[PDB]
Amino acid sequence: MSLSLTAAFLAGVLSFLSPCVLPLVPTYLFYLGGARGRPLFNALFFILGFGAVFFLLGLPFTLLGGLLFEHRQTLARVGGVVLVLFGLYMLGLRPRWGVSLRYEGETSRPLGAFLLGATLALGWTPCIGPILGAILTLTAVGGGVGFLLAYILGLAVPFFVVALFADRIKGWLRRAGRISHYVEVLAGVVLVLVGVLLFTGTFTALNTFFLRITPEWLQRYLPS
Numbered sequence: 001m002s003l004s005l006t007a008a009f010l011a012g013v014l015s016f017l018s019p020c021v022l023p024l025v026p027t028y029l030f031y032l033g034g035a036r037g038r039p040l041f042n043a044l045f046f047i048l049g050f051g052a053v054f055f056l057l058g059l060p061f062t063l064l065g066g067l068l069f070e071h072r073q074t075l076a077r078v079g080g081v082v083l084v085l086f087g088l089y090m091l092g093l094r095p096r097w098g099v100s101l102r103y104e105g106e107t108s109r110p111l112g113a114f115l116l117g118a119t120l121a122l123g124w125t126p127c128i129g130p131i132l133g134a135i136l137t138l139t140a141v142g143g144g145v146g147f148l149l150a151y152i153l154g155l156a157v158p159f160f161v162v163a164l165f166a167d168r169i170k171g172w173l174r175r176a177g178r179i180s181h182y183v184e185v186l187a188g189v190v191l192v193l194v195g196v197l198l199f200t201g202t203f204t205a206l207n208t209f210f211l212r213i214t215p216e217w218l219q220r221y222l223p224s
Contacts, residue, residue, distance in 0.1 A: 033112035
């Protein structure tokens with residue numbers, strides 16, 4: 001009689017409107033790498049990959065709850081370093097000011113796709129850290145196998161809808177013009193701004209600013 005999918009559904013929508021996630025960002029880079037052009041296979045692959053990691057890493061989370069009694073805030077610092085490094089590369093600047101010519105590459109297109117995948121796996125979002133950490137305390141006293149599946153399925157729904165709608169939008173992307181290039185760098189700038197404001201902001205008004213992005217029309221739609 002209880003539907004855990006409801007929570008996962010609302011959570012999925014929150015992640016979509018969350019400036020710390022924004023699936024449209026990685027997708028814009030994935031499509032920028034060319035890849036193959038198969039959203040169904042790309043989604044299924046990401047779903048399986050993410051699910052496998054969430055399960056394999058979810059297992060030790062039972063014993064990892066005992067480590068929470070100590071302190072591992074130093075793990076949040078690593079995320080900031082990665083964000084800074086990514087921001088520097090996003091600026092289009094190279095660390096080695098001595099690039100030669102007549103280099104090799106060939107299949108450099110799938111490299112951006114594979115790298116972006118590993119990026120989302122290694123690049124942990126500190127904004128979702130406390131939120132995920134709160135789930136460990138719940139899985140330590142019980143668990144939530146169906147909950148994990150509901151979370152993945154919840155994100156699968158919008159992904160499938162977007163994948164199908166992207167078919168008609170694909171013809172528009174090439175018809176638009178140079179406008180698609182404006183939003184390309186725009187999202188990147190905001191991403192770096194939020195990332196740097198979170199690292200240097202820490203526990204401040206920045207944590208409360210996340211409530212300014214959350215639509216009040218969704219909060220007023222709660223029966224409880």
